[PDB]
Amino acid sequence: IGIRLTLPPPKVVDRWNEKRAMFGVYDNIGILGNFEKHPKELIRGPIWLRGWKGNELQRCIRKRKMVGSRMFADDLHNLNKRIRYLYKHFNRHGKF
Amino acid sequence: LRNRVTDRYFRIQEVLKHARHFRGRKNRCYRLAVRTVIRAF
């Protein structure tokens, strides 16, 4: 019986956390900051996709180029395999 | 898993409510019930 008896502990959420209070502050820095910095330089993330939208396969490719050199053998291989698969799936398998 | 169904029991019960008074497993087991209930309808 997947459904349960004890209803959960109350999910407390401060909507005025230091994160949420200042979410989006400085974001939009170009159009009112003499274009010193692009908003794409605000974002913090994995280097291979920083201000770059991409696609599944494309992302993989980017990762392989940007980072692959300094990537863990067990994971690099996996990445390569993924790329191989992904190309096949896109360039051949689907509809239209 | 991101999102899996919490409310499934209720769906099951909806059909089983209409199947309560059938004979045998038709009233207990959802799979059998559904076919019977639809037929009845």
């Binding site: 997947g2 459904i3 349960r4 209803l7 959960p8 | 899996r4 919490t6």
Partner: peptide, 26 residues
């Protein structure tokens, strides 16, 4: 342990109803 709340609430309500049906008050 599934992630929701609404479903749980519903279940609780159902249980309550059942209880009421079973042992109703004077």
């Amino acid at each position: 342990v599934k992630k929701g709340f609404r479903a749980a609430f519903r279940f609780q309500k159902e249980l309550e109803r059942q209880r009421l049906l079973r042992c109703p008050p004077p």
